Design a protein around this ligand. Structure first.
Ligand SMILES: [Ag+]
Length: 180
């Protein structure tokens, strides 16, 4: 048949999230072909009939069977994010995020955090540096949380690989011993 994913991201692509199966054709929910226009919270048997619901486009994988997210898609489609994580060593450890991720106002910063529950929430954060096309979250948020950045990356697989096939604390690499 072919792979109908020949196109990639468009302009305005902040390289924080390429969305690998968080959009496009990944299980969003279940529907009965006799109940189109509905929105079931999750798979199961139809309440209107007694048949197992039919899955959308991809049909029964998406989160790799709980490997990924808890089968919830915290992806508002037109809104991408970037996860909080420390991006320096030796330098002064700060939470690195895309410069457009945070809200600058007055003499402080706000972050609309991507909460794991599939929602977005505003947080007052300390943010005042810029480094390498990114900004520094001095204080405010924690690693493992995300912020809204509305940009796309080329291949999101690298990022996706964290948390699915890869686990471990700090999730770092090429850092066995650090003395000198
Ligand atoms: Ag039916």
């Amino acid at each position: 048949m072919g792979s109908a994913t020949v196109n990639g991201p468009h302009d305005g692509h902040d390289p924080a999230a390429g969305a690998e199966l968080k959009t496009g054709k990944r299980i969003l929910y279940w529907r009965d072909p006799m109940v189109p226009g509905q929105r079931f919270d999750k798979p199961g048997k139809s309440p209107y009939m007694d048949m197992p619901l039919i899955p959308v486009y991809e049909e029964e994988n998406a989160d790799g069977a709980a490997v990924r997210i808890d089968g919830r898609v915290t992806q508002n489609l037109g809104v991408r994010t970037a996860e909080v994580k420390l991006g320096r060593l030796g330098s002064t450890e700060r939470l690195l995020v895309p410069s457009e991720a945070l809200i600058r106002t007055g003499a402080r910063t706000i972050a609309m955090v991507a909460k794991g529950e599939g929602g977005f929430d505003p947080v007052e954060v300390k943010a005042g540096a810029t480094a390498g096309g990114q900004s520094e979250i001095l204080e405010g948020l924690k690693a493992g949380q995300q912020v809204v950045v509305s940009g796309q990356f080329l291949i999101d697989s690298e990022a996706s690989l964290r948390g699915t096939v890869a686990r471990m604390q700090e999730t770092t690499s090429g850092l066995e011993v650090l003395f000198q």
